Structure formats: C-alpha cells, structure tokens
Amino acid sequence: YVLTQPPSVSVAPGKTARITCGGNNIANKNVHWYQQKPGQAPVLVIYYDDDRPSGIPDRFSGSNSGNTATLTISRVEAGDEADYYCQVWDSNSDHVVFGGGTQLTVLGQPKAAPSVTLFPPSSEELQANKATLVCLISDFYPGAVTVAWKADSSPVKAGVETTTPSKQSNNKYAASSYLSLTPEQWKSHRSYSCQVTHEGSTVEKTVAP
C-alpha cells in the first residue's frame, strides 16, 4: 500500500496550512499524523482521523475521503515548523505504512539570495596527488538550492556530493558541494564552474588552473 505526500509546503504566520496524504479508498483506513521536529522524538498530533490528544491545540484537525486525507493547521506559529508523517495500518500484508513526509516552512524572514564562493585544489592536496573543488553557498533564504557542476560548458555529474541546507547563526541558510578530480583531469580541462540555482536565479562562480 502506498502513501504519497508532498515534499514541502510554505505558509505565513497567520494563514492556515493544508497537507495531503492520499491512497485508494483510504477512507477504509484509520489515518494518523505525527510531528517530528529536527532532533527530538516524533509526536502524535492526530489519530483515528479526527480524534485529537489533549495538549494538542485546537489548531489541529483531520479529514479523510476518497483518495486523499488531509491535515490542517491554523493560526500557524513559528514553533510549528517541522516534518509531518501520515500513518495507517494495512490488513492484507500486516504492514504499518508511512508517507514520504512534508516540511512545514513558516516564513518569518525577508527572503534573501545566495552567496557562492568557489575554492580550488589547495597547494598541499595536489602534492598528495588529489584534487577537490569546494563550492560554498551561504546567507540565503529559504533553504532550498540546486547545484550543478560543469567543465568547459559540458555538464558534469560523475563524482559529486552536496550537503543539505542548515540554519546558520543569523538564522539564514547555507550549503556545501564538493567535486573530486584527479590532478590529471584538473589539468586537461581549462575551467570548472559551480552553478547554483535558487528560486529561478542562477548565481555562478568559476575557477581555472
């Protein structure tokens, strides 16, 4: 049995938020929703479709119909940011089934643009017969980027890594992206370029041997 959830949603402090969790004749199933904040342990917010534990604010509510059950949060606050999972129990395969999850992003900051800084293979690392290009994207909002490396126009995927946005000290976001080459490969090409995409924009820096 499959439970399809949306990656993320965004709302403003005040407006309400919807979250979709749907599967064939899901009404036959008792849906349950869990709130897992970064680090801590998950928490039941809504079970048995509508029923709600004490301690959970009236700002929570459940629905279930056709091929989609929904979770609604109103008067959204700041401390409401987290990941939300819908869960049900299957009977024809004795399975408990979870969903992909959804990030709730409460906008309380004026969205900003990235700051890319591209480091080239250090003097030492090369003497070690190694080569690592380090891209550094910082001070952006909200935390959602898209990096892509290219060598002389032609795209490059083989041998890349990238971290996930993490909230800095000034609450803004930041990320990392490493490309690993052999000194031979670093010499052949004439230039390598780190390309970041943030909500349409495409800030780019480039370094050459």
Binding site: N30, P42, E125, L136, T163
Partner: protein, 224 residues
Amino acid sequence: EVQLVESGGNVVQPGGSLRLSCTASGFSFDDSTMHWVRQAPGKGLQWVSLISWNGGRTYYADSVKGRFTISRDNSKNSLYLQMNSLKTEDTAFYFCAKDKGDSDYDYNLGYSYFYYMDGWGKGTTVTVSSASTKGPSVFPLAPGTAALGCLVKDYFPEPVTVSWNSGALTSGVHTFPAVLQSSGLYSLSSVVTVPSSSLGTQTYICNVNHKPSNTKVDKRVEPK
C-alpha cells in the same frame, strides 16, 4: 511520566550482528504492544516490526524478514531486536514505540486491531560500514569581506568537531554537515567570513578534533 530509553547500537561490519534493548517505565508495560521503527539519516520513518502485549502476534517488515527477530520480556519491562546478516542499508536511527492496543472484538465477525503509536523514545544510532576508524586530512582553504577555512576530509566514523583560535573566534564561524564519500569516508568544512582589511594583522588557526582516533590537527590559514 512516560519514558523509553533505547540502547545497544554501535558500529557493525556488513555481515555481523547486533541486539538492541529498550527500557520502559511509567506505565503498565504488559498492557501494551511495542514497535520498532527506524529512520535513515535525514530520511523518512520506516516500520520494522511489532509485538503484541504477550507475543500472540508479531509481524516483520518485508525487507527485514529472514534477518531480524523481535522479542520481549514483560517481567523486565524490556523489548528486544536481534539483527543478523546486517547490511549497510540497515544503517539508521532506531526508536521503540508504544501502542494502546485498541481493537474491536467480534467472535463470529472477525478480530480487527488498530495500530497507532502514542509514545516515542529518543532512539539509538546504528552504523554499518566496512571502513576502519581513521584520522582526517586537513587542507587549507585560503582566500568588502572574504572567506577562509579548513577542508577536513577522509575520516571515520562520526563525529568531528572544529574551532578557531581555541574557541576565541566565534563570530562568522559556521561548521558544516558531513557528506559521505563513495569510499565510506566522511568529509566537511568550516568557513569563517572576516573583514578583508584586517588580514596580515590577525592569525586564523583551524583547531580540529577527531576523538574516535584521538587526533588533533592545527592548521593556520594565510592568503595566497
């Protein structure tokens, strides 16, 4: 009032085994079914298995079948999970959950149970890799502002900490998450943005500390 303190997990090699424990307290352990759920680093929750208040019914997630085994000892407030023929895939966080047991009982219509977890623990970490503990190589990332830092690459396992001028410099410092190589080794970075006018008059030293190896590297970062 309610508590759930998992324990037992460590670093295991592909093929090895491990047995996790779960201490309950704050409620009648005997009147509740228990759950094992895992969650890969930054990934979604996944259901492993469950066990009824006695043992009358226990199911395994399709993937962990033939390799994992669940068990409990109501007299000791404890839940158990044995993990054999381990795989790198099985690496993740692990939680023991509590379920009321709710159900509708019919003797001639059929028994139908309902499963929802209303009590979670913080969990214990499981790492499955064929790498051997190792210290990190620390290369210098040198530069109205400018950014410089360290490139702590190739180490195992987590974690590694970083600082500057012995924790003296904090403003503008941001230590990053660790990425995972295709070799099974970790790597990361530590950038510190500073006024590009006060260079040549102030030193910047990257203090690294990988404790599962007792290593401590100190790099000074200067302009090129």
